[PDB]
Design a protein around this nucleic acid. Structure first.
Lengths: 99, 159, 104, 99, 50, 56
RNA sequence: AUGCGAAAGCAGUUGAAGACAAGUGCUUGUCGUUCGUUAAAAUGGCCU
């Protein structure tokens, strides 16, 4: 388990799982986390190279997937973003708030 | 500053000022910061909470912290607090709401087992017990707001 | 209006409306001070409700139902906040028992 | 429409235009001109369904015998009313509670 | 019990047998609520041990 | 169960796995505690009827 | 009862013409009729 007692509620959550069973992408609204499965706590780094466990995006996150263990694909309420896992940095952006 | 209120208004705000802007802002800009800021350091938050400046920023920062942050981390940071202002805060609470009571419960769990004195604890228990009495009274009030034998009769009609 | 038997009497008299405006002052006051210590004003409200709710339901549509919903929200918030009050009260019981054992 | 294919039976509102009782049932042969019958619902009903809700006035299903002597109407209140068409008289079959 | 108390209040004030049962029911729920009220204190107490 | 936690709080803090060591107790207390408010509502409506008929 | 929102709730909504039926030109009521907007009843219950 891992139960925080938050008194704010998102209607919109998602989560995705690494293929080697280790990285759990827990996407709440707007602020993703990457956790190690074995303790259900945030990925605490000794390297600390700005691939930190907590991410902030623009608006409420609709859907995250990982296509391989090379790219995390995130969709919020306005855009769609494609991010690496090799490095804590965004790669591709796509505007959707027309549609 | 319209530019700074706008970069508050913006959701994402990467590393630098979100590290250390409380040392820069510590009135109105601070209010915009406390209602909206993506990342805020828990140390700064708790130090503002136990700062006795008390513009109901207690209520607001208590709301912000128990919304965004997790109770175990809150436990360890309130453990890294200093006890004298903890006495100040609990004394102020029993002097004179949801986020406030959540914070009181959390700091009770943070101090734990050891260092609580007789006068303090009897004052606290009288306070919370009177409030439990009137609270349950108000809840019962809330439920309240949620809510053939004329065998012989002698009368007369008007004719 | 101080003693509850007198309050049932004054309710029977005022039910013989101006009782609706009584409800109005009680409602505005309650939604402006929910954590009140006094034991007269919620006594007034509970006794009015448990005596003559029917014509209160059937009297009007606007002037009562607005602030009805207001104090309804208020006291529902109170019933949300009750269980953590129980939790704190339990913790204070624990600490009192521990300090007593430290004494004995 | 009849099941063998010889007959068609339907309603009308010109007797609303020409009467208090609004609807008129007609039934007509197709390939030959053997049968041509017309009667108002104001006769076919009772009078005791006048002083009730509108629901027992709303005909919701229609069917005819293949030869041409029985007509079944089905009301919006769960009563199946069958009219033998000779004297144009009725009989009740009561089971349903919905239409 | 809520819905029957909603319905039959007239027969309640008419009849004495049920007035016996309602006063005892007043005790038992008040007896039961005291039990479940004490339940939360011992649950929160165990939170203090974490 | 009130008195057990008064005394051996030291060793209880000492063990890590509070939840899995006290699984059953945690469950039972969860049961009664979150049952409570329905009982509250029923008590309120009961007392409303009670006063309403035994005042007259 | 719609919009927003968490299972809390938070705001607002309930208005027009027509045609007909009844009681006595008048009142109510009805709508297998139109506009405008974010808008309970005919003793009649489940197969082998």
């Amino acid at each position: 388990i891992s139960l925080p007692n938050f008194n704010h509620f998102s209607n919109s959550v998602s989560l995705a799982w690494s293929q080697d069973g280790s990285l759990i992408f827990h996407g709440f609204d707007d602020k993703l986390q990457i956790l190690d499965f074995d303790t259900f706590k945030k990925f605490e780094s000794l390297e600390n190279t700005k691939t930190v466990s907590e991410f902030t995006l623009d608006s409420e996150i609709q859907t995250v997937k990982l296509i391989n263990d090379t790219n995390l694909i995130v969709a919020t309420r306005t855009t769609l973003n494609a991010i690496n896992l090799l490095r804590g940095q965004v790669i591709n952006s796509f505007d959707l708030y027309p549609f | 500053p319209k530019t700074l209120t706008f970069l508050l208004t913006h959701p994402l705000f990467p590393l630098s000022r979100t590290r250390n802007l409380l040392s820069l802002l510590r009135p109105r800009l601070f209010k915009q910061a406390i209602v909206t800021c993506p990342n805020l350091p828990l140390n700064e938050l708790l130090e503002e909470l136990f700062s006795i400046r008390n513009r109901e920023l207690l209520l607001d920062i208590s709301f912000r912290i128990l919304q965004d942050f997790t109770r175990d981390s809150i436990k360890q940071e309130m453990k890294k607090l200093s006890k004298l202002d903890v006495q100040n805060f609990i004394e102020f609470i029993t002097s004179g709401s949801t986020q406030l009571f959540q914070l009181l419960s959390l700091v009770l769990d943070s101090i734990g087992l050891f260092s609580l004195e007789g006068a303090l604890l009897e004052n606290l228990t009288l306070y919370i017990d009177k409030q439990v009495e009137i609270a349950e009274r108000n809840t019962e009030l809330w439920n309240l707001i949620d809510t053939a034998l004329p065998t012989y009769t002698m009368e007369y009609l008007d004719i | 209006w101080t003693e509850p038997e007198i309050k049932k009497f004054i309710l029977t008299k005022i039910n013989t409306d101006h009782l609706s405006k009584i409800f109005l002052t009680i409602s505005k006051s309650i939604t402006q001070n929910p954590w009140n210590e006094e034991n007269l004003l919620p006594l007034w409200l509970k006794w009015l409700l448990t005596l003559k709710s029917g014509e209160l339901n059937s009297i009007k549509d606007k002037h009562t139902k607005k602030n009805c919903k207001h104090l309804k929200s208020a006291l529902r918030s109170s019933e949300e906040i009750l269980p953590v009050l129980l939790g704190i009260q339990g913790r204070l019981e624990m600490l009192r028992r521990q300090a007593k054992l430290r004494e004995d | 429409i009849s099941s063998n294919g010889k007959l068609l039976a339907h309603m009308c509102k010109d007797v609303s235009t020409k009467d208090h009782e609004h609807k008129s049932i007609s039934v007509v042969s197709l390939f030959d001109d053997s049968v041509n019958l017309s009667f108002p619902l104001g006769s076919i009903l009772s009078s005791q369904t006048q002083s009730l809700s509108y629901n027992t006035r709303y005909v919701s299903s229609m069917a005819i015998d293949n030869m041409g002597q029985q007509l079944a109407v089905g009301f919006a209140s769960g009563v199946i009313s069958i009219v033998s068409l000779a004297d144009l008289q009725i009989r009740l079959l009561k089971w349903h509670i919905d239409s | 019990v809520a819905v029957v108390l909603e319905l039959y209040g007239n027969t309640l004030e008419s009849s004495p047998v049920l007035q016996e049962l309602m006063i005892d029911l007043k005790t038992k729920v008040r007896h039961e609520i005291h039990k479940s009220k004490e339940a939360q204190r011992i649950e929160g107490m165990l939170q203090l041990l974490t | 169960v009130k008195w057990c936690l008064i005394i051996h709080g030291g060793y209880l803090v000492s063990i890590p796995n509070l939840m899995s060591t006290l699984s059953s107790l945690h469950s039972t207390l969860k049961r009664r505690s979150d049952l409570l408010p329905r009982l509250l509502a029923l008590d309120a409506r009961l007392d409303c009827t009670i006063n309403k008929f035994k005042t007259l």
